């Protein structure tokens, strides 16, 4: 019977936010959403029988190695930590900071939270209850199982509850690799990589590319070569997830979906054979093209372009629908592209795997927990592991001979380079390239310093900026 070949492919990523010279973790992104989502976005497998496949970055991997040994040192939190007697002004300035940043998401959607924001002063309980419910804001679905009373309970934490809390979620931390391996040794997921520090792999191996989508842009002159730090991401990722894994990763996910006719060159020379990238890339680059076939470029290596609007649809606009509408819709969908093509259409849905939960009630767990339970009991929907989707024989294939260089973001890559902000970043990093002496130059060269260049009303968006500078001054000595 013709089925439809379904491929989810959650892609994980943080920029080092370990600063080198204090050692210490500036922002606790890598840590809040370890205990939210890198450890639960695969755990769904062990209740749903699916395939679900995921994109770790080696630099997230790194960090999250170190929160697991105990060892890395969190200035935000520190101050969670802290008995609020002990705080300073400044760290319950931070607190209430984090706390309106996150205000309006609905994983923040506690009564008591909504208490201490119109109070005009703390007391020690108070802020005890502040940071406790910081953290339990955060909760990934495991643990919502068993810390059921505390989130109930709702208000009135003690230092020993809250101590109780974190070290929970240690222990989520120190699985959360361990559950990787075991969805990949079990058969239920193929996990991928990326280049080590999730840079732009076409603009280090030839930044005129931008001009091919947006040639009235002025970029500065890379008056050194990135080509071999190219080079390096992609064998330091592979070294890295060998010693997670035990294989050599022959999948990868691009960096913002970023490819050209030299990345993929690049990525073919380094033995990758499969990667994904957008649906503009494919319409930019081929008349009358079809998402749901698997390409070969040049006869080098596998690609799939995944279908935009489905991973929109998740990523953009579920947060505000009802979980059971929302799945209703995301089926109906399936069914038109089945009814639409005479071949098995394979359906890659692909996009970040932790950014967009926050903003559905209950943390998305209605919405997933519906999706995969539906999901598994349609007999016309196969869903892949990556493996199963480049080896599947019954898929319609073409060969493609060039691509129009670009990213997800509409295509393009001006959300990175071209203006008079991230064009500094591109010459503070050329310069420093010329004198660079050790690889925390190739940290340096990871899209999230340039994405953030330029972005003004973004609280923390200053401590990126140290980062970025930091690591830049560290490549030099
Ligand atoms: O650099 C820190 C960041 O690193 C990782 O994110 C990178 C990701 O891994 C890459 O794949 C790529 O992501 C692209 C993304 O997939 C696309 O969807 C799109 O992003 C759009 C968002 O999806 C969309 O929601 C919106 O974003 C706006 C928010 O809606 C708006 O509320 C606000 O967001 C603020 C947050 O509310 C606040 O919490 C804080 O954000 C912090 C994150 O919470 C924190 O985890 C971390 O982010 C990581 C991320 O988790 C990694 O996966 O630091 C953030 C900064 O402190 O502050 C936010 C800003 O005030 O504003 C945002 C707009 O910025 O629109 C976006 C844009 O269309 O494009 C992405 C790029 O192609 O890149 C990212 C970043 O490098």
Request: net charge negative; glycine share 4%; hydrophobic share 40%.
């Amino acid at each position: 019977m013709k089925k439809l070949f379904l491929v989810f492919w959650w892609h994980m990523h943080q920029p080092l936010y370990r600063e080198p010279y204090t050692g210490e973790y500036l922002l606790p992104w890598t840590f809040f959403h370890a205990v939210k989502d890198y450890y639960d976005m695969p755990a769904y497998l062990k209740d749903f029988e699916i395939k679900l496949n995921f994109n770790l970055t080696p630099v997230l991997i790194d960090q999250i190695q170190e929160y697991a040994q105990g060892k890395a040192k969190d200035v935000f939190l520190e101050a969670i930590r802290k008995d609020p007697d002990d705080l300073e002004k400044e760290e319950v300035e931070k607190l209430i900071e984090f706390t309106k940043l996150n205000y309006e998401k609905p994983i923040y959607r506690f009564e008591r939270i909504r208490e201490l924001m119109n109070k005009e002063k703390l007391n020690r309980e108070e802020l005890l209850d502040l940071q406790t419910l910081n953290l339990l804001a955060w909760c990934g679905r495991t643990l919502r199982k068993d810390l059921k009373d505390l989130l109930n309970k709702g208000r009135n934490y003690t230092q020993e509850e809250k101590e109780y809390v974190l070290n929970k979620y240690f222990e989520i931390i120190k699985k959360t690799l361990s559950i990787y391996r075991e969805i990949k040794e079990e058969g239920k997921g193929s996990v991928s990589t990326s280049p080590y520090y999730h840079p732009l792999i076409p603009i280090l191996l030839n930044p005129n590319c931008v001009y091919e989508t947006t040639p009235n842009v002025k970029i500065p002159d890379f008056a050194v070569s990135f080509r071999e730090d190219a080079s390096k991401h992609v064998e330091l990722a592979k070294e890295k997830y060998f010693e997670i894994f035990g294989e050599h990763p022959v999948y990868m996910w691009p960096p913002e979906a970023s490819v050209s006719n030299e990345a993929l060159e690049l990525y073919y020379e380094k033995g990758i054979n499969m990667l994904a990238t957008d649906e503009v890339i494919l319409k930019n680059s081929v008349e009358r093209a079809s998402p749901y076939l698997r390409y070969y470029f040049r006869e080098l290596i596998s690609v799939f372009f995944r279908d935009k609007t489905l991973s929109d649809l998740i990523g953009f606009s579920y947060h505000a629908w009802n979980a059971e509408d929302a799945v209703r819709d995301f089926i109906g969908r399936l069914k038109k592209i089945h009814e639409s093509v005479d071949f098995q259409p394979v359906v890659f849905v692909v996009l970040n795997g932790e950014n967009c939960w926050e903003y559905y009630e209950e943390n998305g767990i209605p919405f997933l927990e519906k999706l995969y339970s539906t999901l598994e009991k349609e007999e016309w929907i196969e869903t892949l592991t990556l493996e199963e989707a480049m080896r599947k024989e019954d898929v319609k294939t073409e060969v493609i001979e060039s691509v129009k260089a670009g990213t997800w973001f509409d295509g393009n890559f001006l959300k990175w380079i071209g203006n008079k902000e991230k064009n500094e970043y591109w010459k503070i990093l050329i310069e420093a390239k010329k004198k660079a002496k050790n690889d925390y130059i190739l940290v340096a060269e990871g899209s999230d310093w340039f994405w953030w260049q330029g972005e003004e009303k973004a609280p923390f968006v200053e401590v990126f900026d140290k980062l970025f500078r930091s690591f830049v001054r560290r490549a030099q000595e």
